[PDB]
Structures are given as C-alpha cells and as structure tokens.
Amino acid sequence: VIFNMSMMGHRVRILPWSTFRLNLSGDEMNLHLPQSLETRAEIQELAMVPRMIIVQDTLTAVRKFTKRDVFLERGEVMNLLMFLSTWDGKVPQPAILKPRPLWTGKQIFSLIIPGHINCIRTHSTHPDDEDSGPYKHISPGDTKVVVENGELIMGILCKKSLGTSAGSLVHISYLEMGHDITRLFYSNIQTVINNWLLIEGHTIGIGDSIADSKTYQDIQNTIKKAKQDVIEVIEKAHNNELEPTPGNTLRQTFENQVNRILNDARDKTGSSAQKSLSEYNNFKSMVVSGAKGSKINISQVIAVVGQQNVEGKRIPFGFKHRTLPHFIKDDYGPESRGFVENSYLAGLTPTEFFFHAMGGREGLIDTAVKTAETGYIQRRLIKSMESVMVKYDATVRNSINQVVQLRYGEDGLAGESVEFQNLATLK
C-alpha cells in the first residue's frame, strides 16, 4: 500500500482494532492500494520506506543503554537478544566473567550494528579539552564514540551519533550496506531498547524541576543584579549621562543596552541550571541525548522564562506611556516592559502572565501564517521543476527538452550516496 509528490509504500498487516498502526521512526490518513501488478512491483522496488530514508522515546533510552554504568544479567540479556532479528544465535562472551556474568549495554548493541562498519563520533557532552588531553582515546566520561568491525568499543550513543546527520551510524550503514540492512538496524534499535526500557525506565516529575537551594540563590542574585543594572542604565539615560552610539539613536541605544542585560541574565542563569541538573535527573537526560526539548526550555522551567518580546521589541506602551495601568507612566523597568523574572515552576506574577500571553500570541500568529506561506512555496517549486528530469545522455532537461544542466549537480552524481569529507591537500 502507498500513502503520504513523493509517497512511501508500505506492507499492510491486518490488526484487530480500528485505528491505523504505523511504526513511526494522530493525523488521519487514507492509504491507496495499487491494483495493477506492474505498478505494485515498481512501488515495492523504489517507493518503499527503506529506500525513502528514530523516535524521541528511543534516543533518550539509547543514551542510557550505552552508558558504561549499565550492566545486564544473563536473564535480562536473553530477552533483549530474543527481539534481535539479525542475531547469529550465539550469545556473546560477557565483559565481566567473574564473579558473575554481566553483559555491558554496548555488547548487546554490538550485535545490533549490522556487518562491519567503522566510524568515529562524539557525544553531546564531550569536553573540547578532552580530545587534546592525554585521555583522548580513553575518554574519562565515555564521550567519544568509536566503532570497529561493527562493535561499539566505546562511547555513549545519542542523536549526534545514532540520529540522522552527515556522519552517523545509520548514515554509514546505509552507504556501506544499503537500505534493506539499514531498516533492520532501525527495527533492532527500536525493539531492543523498548524491552530494556521496561527494566531501566524513563520518567519525569517535580524533582527534576526542583533544583538545589544553592542555584536558586544564584539565579535570584543574577536576576537581582540584572534588575539593578537595568535601573542604573535607566538612571544614566534619565540624567542624560548615557551617550548614544554613533550608529544608533538614544532611544534605540537604550533599548539595546537593556535587552543585553536581560538577555545575558537568562543565558547565564539558564547555563547554571544545566550544570545544576544531576546525571540521575530526567531533564538532563533528554537534553544530553538531544532527543526532545532544548536547554532553553529547561531554563524557562527552572531559572527564568526571560524577556517577552513583541514584534521584535519589548512590550509596547498600549496605554498612555505605560504598558499596563498598574505601572507608572513612562516606566521602562524590567517588570513594566515585560521582563519575566519568574520561572514556570515558581509561577508568574499577574503582570507577567499577560506579557507572556502577548509574546505567545505573536508566535501563534506567526506559526499560523508561516505554515500557509511555506506550504505555498512547496507547491510552486514543484510545478516549476516537475518536468525537470535526467535523460539518458546524463543531461538535465525539461518537458520542452531544453538543457537545464549538462550534468546533474554539475558532477553527474546522486545526492544520496555522496558523503561529507575533507580532503587534506589544501589546508
């Protein structure tokens, strides 16, 4: 069957319940069935998902799975290997034979890797000085990923290493082996990690949002320092002490100086929040693996939401020289102009809530129009290049047979098989 102009074919499996099942790796859909055998054969040969190409629930667990701390007992290994379709049938020798057998997560994942593919990648939390240090090969934090003969000798996997990119395990396997073998790699990762996840488990709670009292004082101290600094800038402008930059005016220059103070506070406090989270913390696990969320999201939850800019600027004076009736006239302070100093966990003040709504409203309006405009570009581009194709003379021509390019891509090579590399004869 084929469904969503590029469409991906699928092999239908009958299931009892009503809703459609898709191995994503919500929205309603209709699936078309090719009646003719000729097109059915063609669809299964070129339009299949393996030739077209991981969920966020697996990448997060993958990072935990490959951690050196993870050790698997004989009983646990049996379940994980059972779901492995590409298994030779022989249980690998345990890393720690005595006092009791204990298979490391990488050993189980080594069989998941198909064939013999070699690549080197780095974990997200990989210190720069670590590579220059003497412990580059023996990573103190297991932040370096190296695969030899299809075995993950070291390194914790993540989106950078396992996720799609210029260089990744899935990408290397696709070029080295192909699409059919690569699909099994996706299936093995999803199945095996899911079974292991039932043992380790992934969760989230208030404890992740609750940080140590030491960091709370630092966050408030930075917020207090930023607030005092903004007042000092306002006082300088009030007394005409502030001098405008030659490339800007006084009113715009003041808005720039205040923005940096507030912007810097969010980043500095937000960065401290990232260091605050412990390894066991679930918030850190998501961002460290890079699966879902972002460091900014944690910053708004723990440290500070940040400035709520409207139309690229701070909250405008909707009323007479005042953002809201509560604030005095011609007030350019943090609270008045929409600076949100309270994190989501702590709770926003009544003034901040409306300012937050104003900022969110702009995003929703932009998102609503962004999809409408972006979708228009996609259809327009396809029509103007629908007839563009590569002929048998290795030339790009349209329906009228006009030569658009002598060779496809000026080289005559497909854009999928090409791999990124850096020749070292010019630097």
Binding site: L15, P16, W17, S18, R74, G75, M78, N79, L81, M82, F83, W87, D88, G89, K90, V91, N195
Partner: protein
C-alpha cells in the same frame, strides 16, 4: 464492530495448534516454541526455570505483538541435552514447585485461622 472478542485472548481458535515446535538452523540444538493464546504470565514461568537448569545454554521468550496473543520461546541446550527435553522437564518442576507452595499454603492458612 472492529473490537476483537474479549475471550480470544485465552480461547483456542478452531483448527489451530496450541503448541508448535520449530527447529532453528542458525545454531545447533535450538528450538522455537510458538505458543498461542498465552501472555507473559506463562512466558516468564518457563524462562526463569530453564535458566536454573545448568544444561541450558540459552533460553528466552518474546511476544511478536500483544494483540496477536501468541508467545514465542527459544531454548538452546548442550549437544547431549535437547531443547525439547528442557521445555518438558522445566514444566514438571513448576508443577512440583507450585504443589509444594499450594500444599504449604494450606498448612499455614489453618494455623493463622486458629491463632
């Protein structure tokens, strides 16, 4: 309409063998027991016992799909032993294991009732 009958989880389908033993050619002395109309309540019962047997090299179970309601058990043993014997012998131990538990429970249940 499309909701499967609730009793199909345990009810045996007409003209469908409950147990099927399939030999595995990937490694010698390996067999697959594709039991039907069963859940993890039965898969873990035999896997753990099979591990206790020293003559078992690899034993495990998995469910291809929960809605399928069929469990697959893979057992591998030493050349002298056989996976088929491992599955048969393990079951007998469970029956004995539960018999002692059931019998001992009846011994202790009356003790608490009287005091």
């Amino acid at each position: 309409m499309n909701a499967p009958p609730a009793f199909e989880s345990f009810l045996l389908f007409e003209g469908e063998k409950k147990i099927t033993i399939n030999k595995d050619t990937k490694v010698p002395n390996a067999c697959l027991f594709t039991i039907n109309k069963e859940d993890h309540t039965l898969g873990n019962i035999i896997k753990s016992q099979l591990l206790k047997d020293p003559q078992v090299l690899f034993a495990g179970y998995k469910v291809p799909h929960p809605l399928e309601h069929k469990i697959i058990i893979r057992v591998q043993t030493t050349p002298d032993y056989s996976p088929q014997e491992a599955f048969t012998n393990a079951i007998t131990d469970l029956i004995s294991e539960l018999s002692l538990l059931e019998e001992r429970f009846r011994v202790a249940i009356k003790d608490k009732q009287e005091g």
